[PDB]
Structure of fiber protein 2:
Amino acid sequence: SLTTIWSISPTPNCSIYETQDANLFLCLTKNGAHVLGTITIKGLKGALREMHDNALSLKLPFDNQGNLLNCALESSTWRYQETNAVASNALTFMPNSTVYPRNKTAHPGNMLIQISPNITFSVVYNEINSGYAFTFKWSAEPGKPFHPPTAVFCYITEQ
Amino acid sequence: SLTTIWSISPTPNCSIYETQDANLFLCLTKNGAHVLGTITIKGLKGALREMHDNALSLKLPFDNQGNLLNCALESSTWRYQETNAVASNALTFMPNSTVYPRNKTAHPGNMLIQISPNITFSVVYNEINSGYAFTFKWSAEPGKPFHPPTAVFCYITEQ
Amino acid sequence: SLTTIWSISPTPNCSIYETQDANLFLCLTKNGAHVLGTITIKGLKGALREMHDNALSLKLPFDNQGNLLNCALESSTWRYQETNAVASNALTFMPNSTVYPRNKTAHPGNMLIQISPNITFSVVYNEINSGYAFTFKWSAEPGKPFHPPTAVFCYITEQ
């Protein structure tokens, strides 16, 4: 049915260190049992303009029905693109809990999304005690603004 | 019509060195002329728990109608996800024989799917005298269990 | 509706240094707000068989309706795969102008599509004053034929 969920927002819609300090643009498109994801995060305010830490994480938790729970992402921006309705009950976009069991250690590695200077990215699925989750991690360069390159990722969905 | 073929199995469904020594989870999703593939292979028994060789291949051969022929993968696990019927006559999931002519040498390279330690992966299409095929190759670390990271790949399908 | 645009051609359909000196096979498939692209370019004549430069670009410009404008690609080969009609008015395949504003500097990096020897690839969206565009760039090895490995890329489309 509905193919696309995204978090597009012209204004800040993500809170990492303080309220609305970042823009998060995550887009998920479903093609059968696969979702193709792209994620772009832009640091806009505070330490995100001059990093102290050398890594940053973002967790998006969902209930067992596929609803986004309170987290760093402004929920009002998490919408079905086609209808512009909030992305409620998106079970068939959730990472498959048989393929990615809750709290299973992910294969020990990550992805280079840039070189010179190097930036790494990883996504871990269902690191959560109930429901579903995405946990994203990026490297960061201390003293510099946080704005990693876009990352692409693919996973198997719940049926 | 049908969008997804996969080989999901809770039990071993692949025979590399001996009967049912591995689990193979290959998932193909069709979006027009492209298929998006993910493949995860887990070594479970025998030398797959303590490798001798430093590379391993898996060939999936198909007839000219898109039916899986006898091979290392348990055919009863190769199913259309949506209907849970065996994946018979999947011609429009086959690697395009104009784009990938039978027995054409593939571009001389491969993909790093892990570093520290390094693991490489490649897929070659239609290395077969009749019909269609996928030939997958992974590096392996001697003395260690075989369980490479998941690989993602994309190809153009038959019409 | 229509899912696939491609430039498949048995004969040369691209003009880099001289008329019809290359074959370009670009395939775009739309899955909601994402397009999955693959691109393969083969140098066939002239300096493309023995390169002088160490990099080569290809720009595909489109009007505001999603029609291909005069460029290096033979327009008669740019077709909807499903109908075999020319790919006219393909607005919903165009790179989103909110996500990729015209003439916005792209994240400063590129992709390795081969090692030993190394080959890099990049795609920049909407580097154009009106309408839409793709600008592709590959490295090349002086003294050798131009035939880089296939590249895969994903972008967000216009609505």
Remarks:
- Residues 1-159 of chain A form a domain with the Adenovirus Type 5 Fiber Protein (Receptor Binding Domain) fold (CATH 2.60.90.10).
- The radius of gyration of chain A is 15 Å.
